[PDB]
Amino acid sequence: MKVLVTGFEPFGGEKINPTERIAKDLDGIKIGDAQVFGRVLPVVFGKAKEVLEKTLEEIKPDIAIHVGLAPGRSAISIERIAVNAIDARIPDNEGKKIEDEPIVPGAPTAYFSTLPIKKIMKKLHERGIPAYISNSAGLYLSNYVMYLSLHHSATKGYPKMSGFIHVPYIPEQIIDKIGKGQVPPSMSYEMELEAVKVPIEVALEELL
Amino acid sequence: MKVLVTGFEPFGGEKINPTERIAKDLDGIKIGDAQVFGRVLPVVFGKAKEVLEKTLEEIKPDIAIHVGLAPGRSAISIERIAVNAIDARIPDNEGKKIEDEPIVPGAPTAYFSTLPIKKIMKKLHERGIPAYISNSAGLYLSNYVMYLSLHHSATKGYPKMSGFIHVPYIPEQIIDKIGKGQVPPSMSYEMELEAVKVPIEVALEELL
Amino acid sequence: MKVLVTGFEPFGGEKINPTERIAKDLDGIKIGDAQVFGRVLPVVFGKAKEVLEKTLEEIKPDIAIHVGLAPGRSAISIERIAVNAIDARIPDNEGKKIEDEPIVPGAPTAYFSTLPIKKIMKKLHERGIPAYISNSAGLYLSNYVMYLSLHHSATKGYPKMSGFIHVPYIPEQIIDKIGKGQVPPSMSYEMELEAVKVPIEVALEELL
Amino acid sequence: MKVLVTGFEPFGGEKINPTERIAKDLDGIKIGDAQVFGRVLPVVFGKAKEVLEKTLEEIKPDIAIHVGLAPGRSAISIERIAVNAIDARIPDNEGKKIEDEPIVPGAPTAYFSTLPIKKIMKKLHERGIPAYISNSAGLYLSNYVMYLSLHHSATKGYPKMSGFIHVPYIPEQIIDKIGKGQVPPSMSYEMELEAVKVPIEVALEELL
């Protein structure tokens, strides 16, 4: 079995993206006989699709877990649904702010994630990790990647399982916000890393 | 030197109080030259006061750092002000819900914390711990203890430094709250423990 | 031209549902030459569907605006997407808590709202009414009804336009909640009523 | 009887301050036999004290209700306590940013509001207006004015009743913030105006 994990580079004026470190830390690990591949994606429309599709064809994973930063969110969230729409609340990293366009013209309006989301959530809770089901991944780069990955699955027959995990800010990202107004929630890096490993294990369990 | 650290027991139907664990962990340890004593206070009006005065008179600490749970808070908070009032939003652990009463009749309306609060915050930031200055400790058991402590100092000439640190929920407290609606912020236990050791260090440094 | 507006009965232990009162205030009114029909729906899976579909066939509206209460939301929200799923966070008004079930087996995973959502938002703004686009209607009764309505449109060819508006609590609903901590946003009833009329006006203008 | 109501000018990038309109709308009215004076204060340290102390001396009111904007707050808030401290999170309207300074060196650490805060809150509730007691007025211009007014009371014997009321944004202030992402709570201007009249009414009734 092959597992792909993706993360994103820094965006939105942030110095770091904890998911870039998660992808790098998960690259090369094994869970049983399963090999994990971790790759970092650009927060850039068009370019993220090219990198994603190249990566999928290269690796042909059985399971793809895509990870993103969700600023302001207080627990791990497991995305249920990917939507065939872009409406960027902020520009991508190249200043491209796409509004009310499909991701893939003519493709289904949405795809459900094919990860065992409820079992993933249950297992995180057992591990002491706050987690819930999210019903919108936004309409920016996280959703864009989530949708393209599920579309690839529906269209190519691989990955068999695909979904998205959003993570809170890590505490060090909060320091800079304190002298500026409201203080967003955060979660320690080590818990976020473990919260990505858990979906892989649960997914590998459920597959075959 | 002697440092008192108090925590509180569980309250409001919570299974746990992280500050109880913190007091018990810091108990008996030494930070530089100073001995640290860790005591757990009851979340009970009257009783907490008796326990607190007995503990202060017994130990005669140079520094008192009082620690409480602040549900819904997303970073470490350092209390600036203790207020001469009780207005309980919920009953204490014996079912007493005291409304509109002084803590100490005739005593001042408020006392400023005598911890070096801004230096504590600066040190917490450079250690990667999100922290801010809170201007109200509530009017339940946290503020009661914070007021009685600072009053004891002004009245008896010790501790020379006294103050209050509120901590968020730890991740494991969040798990049961997921099925039931909104999802409070949390902070790892390890980070909260370090965030109380730091106030001791900088307080010890600012004294003599 | 014929417009159906729906609201919901009280639920989740609430004494009132401001959308029940909105639907009653709009029932029988005319917007220019357009006849409006207001109907209150039960917060009951199954029964809501029977009532909705019967009402749709009875009236055959050109435009359907479905309105629901969204506790904790601070502005008017216009729903972009309906999702083919039920995952009830609380039971419905007959105690039914349905989890991870399709609304219509074999139908599209999602439908986009066919209201002119951006022109509605723009119009509300210039009317001084805070409004935004929501990308999830939840997976309870609002989404259920939103989906069934858009399904009827795609499948029967009427309504021509269909969509969903969520409203905050109205200020009176906040009174009893002030004791128990969290103080939710609200919006005056009059503004909420005006914010439902605006979609009718914009939809009518965009049709033919 | 004579009644002083103050509000503030716009600050912090905001086009309007609703408390400015409130003060101007209340000026010159009578509540029963009592005469209401409405004054707009500058959001400027030093100048606001000069203006406040001059107006208090000129009018010598029996009751002083000071009103201000609290961005982010979801209901009316009646301030319990003013504190003898300035710790400005943002500069004032003249670019001055005071950090960790007392308001009146020598004066008490805090004064309690001498408005019948609990009766005001009870009456606001019966009127369908959400309201709660706040235990911190911040440490910017609202608290500065709250403190100086109560200090004036204790020091000169007038005003006999002094206190502070904070109001949420009004809905028209929210519109430009929807692009910016997050969407703060608001309250209708009409409800906010009514909500400062009630304090005048219950305070007059309290004073003989």
Short mmCIF file of N, CA, C and O in Angstrom, two decimals, chain C residues 58-114:
data_model
loop_
_atom_site.label_atom_id
_atom_site.label_comp_id
_atom_site.label_asym_id
_atom_site.label_seq_id
_atom_site.Cartn_x
_atom_site.Cartn_y
_atom_site.Cartn_z
N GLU C 58 -48.83 22.06 -5.04
CA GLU C 58 -50.06 22.86 -4.84
C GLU C 58 -49.90 24.25 -5.48
O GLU C 58 -50.70 24.66 -6.31
N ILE C 59 -48.84 24.95 -5.10
CA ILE C 59 -48.62 26.33 -5.52
C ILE C 59 -47.87 26.45 -6.85
O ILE C 59 -48.16 27.33 -7.65
N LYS C 60 -46.91 25.56 -7.07
CA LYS C 60 -46.01 25.66 -8.23
C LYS C 60 -45.36 27.05 -8.30
O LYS C 60 -45.51 27.77 -9.30
N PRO C 61 -44.60 27.44 -7.25
CA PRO C 61 -44.03 28.77 -7.30
C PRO C 61 -42.94 28.87 -8.36
O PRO C 61 -42.34 27.86 -8.75
N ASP C 62 -42.71 30.09 -8.82
CA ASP C 62 -41.59 30.38 -9.70
C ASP C 62 -40.29 30.50 -8.91
O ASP C 62 -39.22 30.19 -9.42
N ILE C 63 -40.40 30.98 -7.67
CA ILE C 63 -39.27 31.26 -6.80
C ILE C 63 -39.63 30.66 -5.46
O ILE C 63 -40.78 30.77 -5.02
N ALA C 64 -38.67 29.98 -4.83
CA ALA C 64 -38.83 29.47 -3.48
C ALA C 64 -37.67 29.98 -2.62
O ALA C 64 -36.52 29.73 -2.93
N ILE C 65 -37.99 30.73 -1.56
CA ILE C 65 -37.00 31.16 -0.59
C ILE C 65 -37.33 30.44 0.72
O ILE C 65 -38.38 30.66 1.31
N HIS C 66 -36.42 29.57 1.16
CA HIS C 66 -36.55 28.88 2.44
C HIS C 66 -35.71 29.55 3.51
O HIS C 66 -34.53 29.86 3.29
N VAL C 67 -36.32 29.81 4.67
CA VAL C 67 -35.69 30.58 5.72
C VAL C 67 -35.57 29.72 6.96
O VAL C 67 -36.46 28.92 7.27
N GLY C 68 -34.45 29.85 7.66
CA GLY C 68 -34.24 29.08 8.88
C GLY C 68 -33.41 29.85 9.87
O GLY C 68 -32.71 30.78 9.48
N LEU C 69 -33.47 29.45 11.14
CA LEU C 69 -32.73 30.06 12.23
C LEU C 69 -31.36 29.43 12.30
O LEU C 69 -31.24 28.21 12.25
N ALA C 70 -30.32 30.25 12.42
CA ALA C 70 -28.97 29.73 12.63
C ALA C 70 -28.38 30.30 13.91
O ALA C 70 -27.74 31.37 13.87
N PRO C 71 -28.61 29.61 15.04
CA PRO C 71 -28.12 30.03 16.36
C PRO C 71 -26.63 30.34 16.33
O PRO C 71 -25.84 29.50 15.90
N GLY C 72 -26.25 31.54 16.75
CA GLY C 72 -24.83 31.90 16.91
C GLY C 72 -24.26 32.67 15.73
O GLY C 72 -23.15 33.20 15.81
N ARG C 73 -25.03 32.73 14.64
CA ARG C 73 -24.64 33.53 13.48
C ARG C 73 -25.01 34.99 13.70
O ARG C 73 -26.05 35.30 14.28
N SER C 74 -24.14 35.87 13.24
CA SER C 74 -24.18 37.28 13.61
C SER C 74 -24.77 38.17 12.51
O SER C 74 -25.12 39.31 12.75
N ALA C 75 -24.87 37.62 11.30
CA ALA C 75 -25.45 38.33 10.15
C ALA C 75 -26.34 37.38 9.35
O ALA C 75 -26.35 36.18 9.61
N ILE C 76 -27.09 37.93 8.40
CA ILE C 76 -27.82 37.17 7.39
C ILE C 76 -26.84 36.32 6.58
O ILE C 76 -25.77 36.79 6.18
N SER C 77 -27.17 35.05 6.38
CA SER C 77 -26.35 34.22 5.53
C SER C 77 -27.19 33.64 4.38
O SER C 77 -28.32 33.24 4.58
N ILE C 78 -26.61 33.67 3.19
CA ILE C 78 -27.24 33.17 1.99
C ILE C 78 -26.48 31.89 1.64
O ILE C 78 -25.24 31.90 1.52
N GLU C 79 -27.24 30.80 1.53
CA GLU C 79 -26.67 29.48 1.37
C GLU C 79 -26.33 29.24 -0.09
O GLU C 79 -27.16 29.43 -0.98
N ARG C 80 -25.09 28.83 -0.32
CA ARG C 80 -24.58 28.53 -1.65
C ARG C 80 -24.94 27.12 -2.14
O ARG C 80 -25.24 26.92 -3.31
N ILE C 81 -24.89 26.15 -1.24
CA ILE C 81 -24.90 24.73 -1.61
C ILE C 81 -25.85 23.99 -0.71
O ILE C 81 -25.85 24.19 0.52
N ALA C 82 -26.60 23.08 -1.31
CA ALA C 82 -27.32 22.07 -0.54
C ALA C 82 -26.64 20.72 -0.75
O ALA C 82 -26.22 20.40 -1.87
N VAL C 83 -26.56 19.94 0.33
CA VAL C 83 -25.81 18.68 0.37
C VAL C 83 -26.74 17.48 0.54
O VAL C 83 -27.66 17.51 1.37
N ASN C 84 -26.53 16.42 -0.24
CA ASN C 84 -27.38 15.22 -0.16
C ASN C 84 -27.05 14.36 1.07
O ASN C 84 -26.61 13.22 0.93
N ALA C 85 -27.25 14.89 2.26
CA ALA C 85 -26.93 14.14 3.46
C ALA C 85 -27.70 14.65 4.66
O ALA C 85 -28.00 15.84 4.75
N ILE C 86 -28.00 13.72 5.56
CA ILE C 86 -28.52 14.02 6.87
C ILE C 86 -27.52 13.51 7.89
O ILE C 86 -27.18 12.34 7.92
N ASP C 87 -27.04 14.42 8.73
CA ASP C 87 -26.29 14.03 9.91
C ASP C 87 -26.66 14.99 11.03
O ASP C 87 -26.00 16.00 11.26
N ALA C 88 -27.75 14.64 11.72
CA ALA C 88 -28.41 15.51 12.69
C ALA C 88 -27.60 15.63 13.96
O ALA C 88 -27.32 14.63 14.61
N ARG C 89 -27.26 16.86 14.31
CA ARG C 89 -26.47 17.21 15.48
C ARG C 89 -27.30 17.07 16.76
O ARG C 89 -26.77 16.72 17.80
N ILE C 90 -28.60 17.34 16.64
CA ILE C 90 -29.58 17.16 17.71
C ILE C 90 -30.74 16.39 17.08
O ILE C 90 -30.84 16.36 15.86
N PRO C 91 -31.63 15.77 17.89
CA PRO C 91 -32.82 15.17 17.27
C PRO C 91 -33.74 16.21 16.64
O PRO C 91 -33.71 17.40 17.02
N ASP C 92 -34.57 15.78 15.70
CA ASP C 92 -35.65 16.63 15.23
C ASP C 92 -36.76 16.70 16.30
O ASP C 92 -36.63 16.09 17.38
N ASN C 93 -37.83 17.43 16.00
CA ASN C 93 -38.90 17.61 16.98
C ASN C 93 -39.73 16.36 17.33
O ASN C 93 -40.56 16.39 18.23
N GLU C 94 -39.48 15.25 16.63
CA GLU C 94 -40.06 13.97 17.03
C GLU C 94 -39.00 12.98 17.57
O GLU C 94 -39.22 11.78 17.65
N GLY C 95 -37.85 13.53 17.96
CA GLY C 95 -36.77 12.75 18.57
C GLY C 95 -35.86 12.00 17.62
O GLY C 95 -35.01 11.23 18.07
N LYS C 96 -36.02 12.22 16.31
CA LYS C 96 -35.24 11.47 15.31
C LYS C 96 -33.87 12.10 15.04
O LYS C 96 -33.77 13.22 14.52
N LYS C 97 -32.83 11.38 15.43
CA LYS C 97 -31.46 11.82 15.19
C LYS C 97 -30.85 10.89 14.15
O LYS C 97 -30.33 9.81 14.49
N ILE C 98 -30.91 11.32 12.89
CA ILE C 98 -30.46 10.52 11.76
C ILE C 98 -29.03 10.92 11.41
O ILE C 98 -28.71 12.11 11.29
N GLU C 99 -28.18 9.91 11.24
CA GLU C 99 -26.75 10.12 11.06
C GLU C 99 -26.23 9.46 9.80
O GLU C 99 -26.40 8.25 9.61
N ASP C 100 -25.61 10.26 8.93
CA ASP C 100 -24.95 9.77 7.71
C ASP C 100 -25.88 8.97 6.78
O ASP C 100 -25.60 7.81 6.44
N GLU C 101 -26.97 9.61 6.38
CA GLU C 101 -27.95 9.03 5.48
C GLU C 101 -28.11 10.00 4.30
O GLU C 101 -28.00 11.21 4.50
N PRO C 102 -28.31 9.47 3.08
CA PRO C 102 -28.72 10.34 1.96
C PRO C 102 -30.10 10.98 2.18
O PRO C 102 -30.94 10.42 2.87
N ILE C 103 -30.32 12.16 1.61
CA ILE C 103 -31.67 12.70 1.55
C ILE C 103 -32.42 12.03 0.40
O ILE C 103 -33.55 11.56 0.58
N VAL C 104 -31.80 11.98 -0.78
CA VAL C 104 -32.39 11.26 -1.92
C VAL C 104 -31.33 10.32 -2.49
O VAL C 104 -30.37 10.79 -3.13
N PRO C 105 -31.49 8.99 -2.27
CA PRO C 105 -30.49 8.03 -2.76
C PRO C 105 -30.36 8.08 -4.29
O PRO C 105 -31.37 8.14 -5.00
N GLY C 106 -29.13 8.13 -4.78
CA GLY C 106 -28.86 8.20 -6.23
C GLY C 106 -28.92 9.59 -6.87
O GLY C 106 -28.54 9.74 -8.04
N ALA C 107 -29.39 10.60 -6.13
CA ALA C 107 -29.42 11.96 -6.67
C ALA C 107 -28.06 12.63 -6.45
O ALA C 107 -27.26 12.11 -5.67
N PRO C 108 -27.77 13.78 -7.12
CA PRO C 108 -26.47 14.47 -6.94
C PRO C 108 -26.08 14.72 -5.49
O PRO C 108 -26.94 15.06 -4.67
N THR C 109 -24.80 14.54 -5.18
CA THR C 109 -24.22 14.83 -3.87
C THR C 109 -24.53 16.27 -3.38
O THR C 109 -24.73 16.50 -2.19
N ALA C 110 -24.56 17.22 -4.30
CA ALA C 110 -24.96 18.58 -3.97
C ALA C 110 -25.69 19.28 -5.11
O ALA C 110 -25.61 18.85 -6.27
N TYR C 111 -26.42 20.33 -4.76
CA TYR C 111 -26.98 21.28 -5.72
C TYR C 111 -26.54 22.69 -5.31
O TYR C 111 -26.50 23.01 -4.14
N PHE C 112 -26.21 23.53 -6.28
CA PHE C 112 -25.98 24.92 -6.03
C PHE C 112 -27.31 25.67 -5.93
O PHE C 112 -28.24 25.36 -6.68
N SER C 113 -27.41 26.62 -5.00
CA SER C 113 -28.56 27.52 -4.98
C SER C 113 -28.69 28.23 -6.34
O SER C 113 -27.69 28.62 -6.93
N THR C 114 -29.92 28.36 -6.83
CA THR C 114 -30.17 29.06 -8.09
C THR C 114 -30.70 30.49 -7.87
O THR C 114 -31.05 31.18 -8.81
#
